[PDB]
Write a protein that binds this DNA or RNA. Sequence first.
RNA 1: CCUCCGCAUAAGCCUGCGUCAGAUCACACUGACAAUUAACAGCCCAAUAUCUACAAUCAACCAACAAGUCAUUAUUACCCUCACUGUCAACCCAACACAGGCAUGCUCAUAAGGAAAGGUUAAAAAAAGUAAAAGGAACUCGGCAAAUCUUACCCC
RNA 2: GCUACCUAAGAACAGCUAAGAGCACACCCGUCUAUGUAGCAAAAUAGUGGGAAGAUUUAUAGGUAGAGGCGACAAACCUA
RNA 3: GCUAAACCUAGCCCCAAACCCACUCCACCUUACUACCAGCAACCUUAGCCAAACCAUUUACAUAAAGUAUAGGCGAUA
Lengths: 29, 97, 26, 109, 46, 176, 41, 189, 111
Amino acid sequence: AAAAAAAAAAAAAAAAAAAAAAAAAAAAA
Amino acid sequence: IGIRLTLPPPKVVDRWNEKRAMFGVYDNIGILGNFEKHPKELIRGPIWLRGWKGNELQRCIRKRKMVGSRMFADDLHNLNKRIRYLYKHFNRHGKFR
Amino acid sequence: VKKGFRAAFRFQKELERQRLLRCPPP
Amino acid sequence: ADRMSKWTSKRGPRSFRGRKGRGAKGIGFLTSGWRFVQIKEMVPEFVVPDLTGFKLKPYVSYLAPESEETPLTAAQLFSEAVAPAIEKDGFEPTQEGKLFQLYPRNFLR
Amino acid sequence: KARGNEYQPSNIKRKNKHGWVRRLSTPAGVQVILRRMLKGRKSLSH
Amino acid sequence: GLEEFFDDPKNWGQEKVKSGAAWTCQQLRNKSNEDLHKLWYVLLKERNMLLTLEQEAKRQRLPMPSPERLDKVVDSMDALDKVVQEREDALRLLQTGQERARPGAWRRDIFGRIIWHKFKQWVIPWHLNKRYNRKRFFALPYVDHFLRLEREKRARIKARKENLERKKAKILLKKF
Amino acid sequence: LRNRVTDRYFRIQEVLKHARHFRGRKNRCYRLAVRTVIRAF
Amino acid sequence: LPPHYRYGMSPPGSVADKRKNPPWIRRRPVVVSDEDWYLFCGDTVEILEGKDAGKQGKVVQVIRQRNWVVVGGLNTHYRYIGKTMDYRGTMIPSEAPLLHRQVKLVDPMDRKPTEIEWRFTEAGERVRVSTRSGRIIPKPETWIDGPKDTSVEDALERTYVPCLKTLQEEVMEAMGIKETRKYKKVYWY
Amino acid sequence: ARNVVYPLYRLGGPQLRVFRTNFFIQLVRPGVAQPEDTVQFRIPMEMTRVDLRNYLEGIYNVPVAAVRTRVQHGSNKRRDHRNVRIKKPDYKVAYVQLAHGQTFTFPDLFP
RNA sequence: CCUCCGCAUAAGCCUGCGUCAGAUCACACUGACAAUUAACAGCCCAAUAUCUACAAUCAACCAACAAGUCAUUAUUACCCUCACUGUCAACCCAACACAGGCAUGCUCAUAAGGAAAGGUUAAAAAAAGUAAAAGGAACUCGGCAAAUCUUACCCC
RNA sequence: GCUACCUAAGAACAGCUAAGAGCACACCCGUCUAUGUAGCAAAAUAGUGGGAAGAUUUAUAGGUAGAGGCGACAAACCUA
RNA sequence: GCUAAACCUAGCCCCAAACCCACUCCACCUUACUACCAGCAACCUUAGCCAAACCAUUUACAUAAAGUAUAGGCGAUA
Ligand SMILES: [Mg+2]
Ligand SMILES: [Mg+2]
Ligand SMILES: [Mg+2]
Ligand SMILES: [Mg+2]
Ligand SMILES: [Mg+2]
Ligand SMILES: [Mg+2]
Ligand SMILES: [Mg+2]
Ligand SMILES: [Mg+2]
Ligand SMILES: [Mg+2]
Ligand SMILES: [Mg+2]
Ligand SMILES: [Mg+2]
Ligand SMILES: [Mg+2]
Ligand SMILES: [Mg+2]
Ligand SMILES: [Mg+2]
């Protein structure tokens, strides 16, 4: 019957994506 | 820094095992066993290359006409794909042609 | 882990030679 | 847009929230006015005895003796219905003419 | 315009397009569930 | 009476309840079908009395007085359920010879692997059931490629399992 | 991997012991060191 | 209990066991067999090696998994328990488990450790007998019932009459509930 | 009785009776100030409203007058160490109202 | 001081600012416990027969053209009786505690519902406004914007 | 399940002047300008607008598929 | 001296042999995971990228005979 205490569940989270192509622009002739 | 701090356990290999002491016995069984067997018979391994050197392609072809009948499904399909690739490499690609 | 022993042993024969410059013998 | 959650009765639209339910073994039937009718003979009625004067308790003592196991197989049941077969030197052929059919099982628990 | 609202959920339209019954009613959609029992997904269909 | 959901008020919160020795299944065979039908309804009131305690225990956060009797009430129950179903099966094999009281058959689904299709107890014969007639119990041989790929996926694991227990045996003898 | 090379630490320190006295980052990182120790020799 | 679970000194379903073995720990397994296991609970064993070697003890707990005996009050190391705050509490002696083959049962009449086998004596049958001498070794080791225990007498009344009368029908003959209808034929398929 | 096939009733079959019924019940302390005569249970999901009236009249012999049920959905948003959702299961809740004003309070064990 | 909101319902999500305890911009996260009670709403029909041209619109006047949203009878068969399920929240699709998207019935300024300023200093530059002498398009690709309200004609 | 078009069975259209009418809400659309450009937003906010009893707007379910669909033809639109 | 670093062992690959495995209860072709009602039905050459320096016929899916006879825009190659 010795003293102790409870515990906490602790992790993190990770994810990733990739949106689209890009940023239209201009040029010459 | 993948070098390791505490030195690893020492590998006590027994040179006088039952298998190293009897390594290579019953080879040379053709010359002085009056030619009943060949030393090519005594090896134990795959059934298709039971005494046959081959190449990287030739071991893949000989596996296909000998054992390729009773091969697993995806383990056949990833064996045909190699000969469809090694024929496109050993006969089309490289130097020295 | 790697299958080497001759590299960690040169490391083990180097880490004494960092000890005998940090904490010297009398 | 969940896939691993279990498909229950709370989840669809107002049409799908009425039809499924839980498997509560529905009683009567519905007809012609959305007026339900509870057939009393389908309602499971409990056949409970009177426990008054009954000597058995929901446990026993530890001082009762230990014996070995004996599963009651069909052969051990026949060796005590053979007592009217030794006089001949009881059976049902059909399962139709019985309120409690054995093979296409008919009773409950 | 605003191009994120592409999935307007509707539980009838979910189950009547990717449900268990619609997959089985055609010989091609059986092979979809056989390609997921083989892969061992915890959910076969919707 | 709702005072059967609780035991008598002389052990209400004694933190310990003296109740041991559940009904073992060997002892019940000496009892008949008569008192066993009673004993269930005795054992029913005893199981209901114990679940009322524990969902009041968690409700006020204090621990259970003695959950060591709680597994006794199901062990007396599950043994009794085994006895009556040992007894009914012992006469059902005599009367008809029929194991599997609920009738069924072996049938092949569309998914190839056969199932013990248990029977569904209708009131019209099966050529008239419109719901049953769209259930298709056959092979349709385009699935037989997928049949080999589960016989293979089963067996490669079995080779992978049988490989582990030889390698786990080798380091046992090489340590001892 | 069969034959993954262990003794990289003793290959780095063959250059860095002539690079313990440099300025900036080149006295630490190996990619920036050999662009100087090659020019230093 | 998860696979590759380490069975500590602590019992496997404890509050303190989830401290040391939480459901995410994956420590490498431990090497252990052969069900003829001459150690029982409470055996007067003597110690083969370790510290406090040579002293004889009675074991108080045996763990079949990691091949462990807990020698009672012997081979200790001293720990603190409780102590709840910034003070010492109590230093108690706690014993460490001793492995199989670190342990030998002693001669009950002679007080020497002895290797023990299983021989099949005709008295019945398979008991622990020493190898050096004969002289078999046994296995070592007021309730009054409550209001929901029946008795020693009520357990084995032998009430069963074995008739072929189908229990759900056996209740109605004693209850006297009459049923007048019959069951009509369902299509079971 | 749950998880057994109920035998079928066509038109002139017998009264469907149950011997040694499967399920079990538990009474609770109501937390939301129920009125008097209303006691509350946790019904196993496969048990009907009129079956509870038959259960309590036959086994517990208490004068039930009105039963009212609900399907209390259980907490699904609880996650394990593999980020997988672990459900605490859902159950029924029945509000049995007694007859004749018997006025039963929930007692206080653990004084 | 706002209110460009709202309270329901449908649709969806499925416990997600209830209680206690906790560990840990600032004290909706976690552990345990509780909850939403049908009467509203879903969940309907015993057959073969056989019927049913005249809109709607305040339905009357009048006028329609694009020509319309709602109906039984005759015989046979019918006496068991109130189950099942939705009922929570600050919610939803847009990776977000996202100025976005979001059908209907009510309230049309609220009896609902909320808070633009972390604390100072009042530099440039930038954005949003408000005001401005005299002149009023001299600006500029163009009266673009902003203010005011109007004249006339082309091309297609 | 967005969108093109269709099909079923539904819905909305305040007020004011007198009809693919006009002014004008709700509502749908997106002309011009500024802000925003890793943004509040993988197409927006603010004004300013154009239609708003109809070739209208939109909820629900069903249909048409890539050698194709569909299209008041922009080679558009068919899950950024 | 902080971040960190270092770990063997889970397990696995490749074989050899051997032919593998489906009903605790209940639920599962309707909206699968739902106790309970008057209709349908399976068998169709793979094709191409690629190679021929483009490309259009063509281009592979025990040992020894042998890469031999043959086929082939007689060419690539088979
Ligand atoms: Mg509500
Ligand atoms: Mg986005
Ligand atoms: Mg207010
Ligand atoms: Mg603020
Ligand atoms: Mg501030
Ligand atoms: Mg001026
Ligand atoms: Mg000018
Ligand atoms: Mg302007
Ligand atoms: Mg108009
Ligand atoms: Mg207009
Ligand atoms: Mg158009
Ligand atoms: Mg054009
Ligand atoms: Mg080419
Ligand atoms: Mg080329």
